[PDB]
Curated annotation (Swiss-Prot), chains A, B:
Consequence of gene loss (knockout): The phenotype of disruption mutants is pet, showing that complementation by another adenylate kinase isozyme occurs only under fermentative conditions. The disruption completely destroys the activity in mitochondria, whereas in the cytoplasmic fraction about 10% is retained.
InterPro entries: Adenyl_kin_sub, Adenylat/UMP-CMP_kin, Adenylat_kinase_CS, Adenylate_kinase_lid-dom, AK2, P-loop_NTPase
Binding site for ATP: 14-19, 132, 141-142, 204
Family in the record: Belongs to the adenylate kinase family. AK2 subfamily.
Gene Ontology MF term list: adenylate kinase activity; AMP binding; ATP binding; DNA replication origin binding
Protein's UniProt name: Adenylate kinase
Chain positions found as N-acetylserine: 1
SUPFAM superfamilies from the UniProt entry: P-loop containing nucleoside triphosphate hydrolases
Region (NMP): 34-63
Further comment: Present with 123000 molecules/cell in log phase SD medium.
């Protein structure tokens, strides 16, 4: 095993998934699989799933549980980086999706090993979301206080300007945190019942949260 | 005038919006605006709007209303193809969106000249969706029964294989078409109000529908 990870990283907006996923990524050289990013990449390719997703999506609807799970499957089966495990972010989001994912990873014979849930109190989140900065290109995020860029409003690797989002606000966030707890509790619960769940304290500085995770992972 | 147009093309899936859109382009030399494609392009280009849209939905969410109109406004202001006019397809879809789209075009100085609704019966529609073949790379559509390709499952101009990506499923179709109606009836009613709506029987053969459209537009 060791130097392979098949896991699911969950947490509310503001917990740092975008900050940890990349650390995990480089360590295990695993594939960082984001659902929306997979959706878009597939629509670009002119694939049957991509086109089917495209038409049902750009028509005011959502893509089916199985179209998602069939795409994840396509990725495991073809993505080059999917051979040293993966890091699934933002999926599942309903029980049946967690259900069909397990039933298909089962098929593939490559089960999830961990479901890391990043924990942090809302009050801390709606306060920390106020000062986030994203390199629009890479999506590399920084925080003006907690993980500041080395140069005033500049991306560490490109020297390009960082930007803050209009939705990066207290009111808008409160609605999203509420929605998050209501829909993630059953999935968290699903992962507890199968024994792969692990809580991590996301209230700690980045490097401490990194270490906490690397430890709950059990590799090494 | 005469060979300039600013309009919306509304109608149920399987109605024929994609099949007629290029005529309108020939006739008027204007841009084809499909919000779905607009969004995905913004996202991929690394714009603040791309960034926000890909944050909202990529977290299983629904992209504003304002992000949409503002993204359309970007097309208009800065896209050359949009200096002749534009053939807006698949927007608006709600009334707020219609009110917001109107308000911006009002401020802009270029309000819609026409809203064309493609009408066809639900029984036919499900049939239109079912037999649909598609050339992925170019997006060109065919119907294995009402408008077949010259060579079996082959794109007329490229010879490249066609695909069946229209969610070929019994119930789901009739259920979705019901959704379109409940969603769309107010947009049409909103446009008869504004005095710019024109309905078109899209059940007739393609060229017969185009002549109906061109006459309805009243620019020829
Ligand atoms: N341990 C930490 N302590 C304090 N701030 C942190 C910590 N880790 C990350 N942050 C940050 O708080 C903000 C949110 O983190 P990040 O942007 O990386 O992930 P998330 O907020 O979880 C999200 F992308 F995934 P999204 O909005 O998509 O849910 C950023 O400003 C980031 O710099
Ligand atoms: N008037 C017509 N008579 C017969 N077949 C037609 C006619 N117009 C279009 N078709 C077709 O019916 C199907 C639907 O057409 P098309 O793919 O062009 O538009 P629409 O279904 O209206 C859509 F693409 F824009 P969308 O999926 O965006 O909602 C295709 O199979 C195409 O061949």
């Amino acid at each position: 095993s060791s130097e392979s990870i098949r896991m699911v990283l969950i947490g509310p907006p503001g917990a740092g998934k975008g900050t940890q996923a990349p650390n995990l990524q480089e360590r295990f050289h695993a594939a960082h699989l984001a659902t929306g990013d997979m959706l878009r990449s597939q629509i670009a390719k002119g694939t049957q799933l991509g086109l089917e997703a495209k038409k049902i999506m750009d028509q005011g609807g959502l893509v089916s549980d199985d179209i998602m799970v069939n795409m994840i499957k396509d990725e495991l089966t073809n993505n080059p980086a999917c051979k040293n495990g993966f890091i699934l972010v933002g999926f599942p989001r309903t029980i049946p999706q967690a259900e069909k994912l397990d039933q298909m990873l089962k098929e593939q014979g490559t089960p999830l090993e961990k479901a890391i849930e990043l924990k942090v109190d809302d009050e801390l989140l709606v306060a920390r979301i106020t000062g986030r900065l994203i390199h629009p290109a890479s999506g590399r995020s920084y925080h003006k206080i907690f993980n500041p860029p080395k140069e005033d409003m500049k991306d560490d690797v490109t020297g390009e300007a960082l930007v803050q989002i209009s939705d990066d606000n207290a009111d808008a966030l409160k609605k999203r945190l509420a929605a998050y707890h209501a829909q993630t509790e059953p999935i968290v619960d699903f992962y507890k019942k199968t024994g792969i769940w692990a809580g991590v304290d996301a209230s700690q500085p980045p490097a401490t949260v990194w270490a906490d995770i690397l430890n709950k992972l059990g590799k090494n």
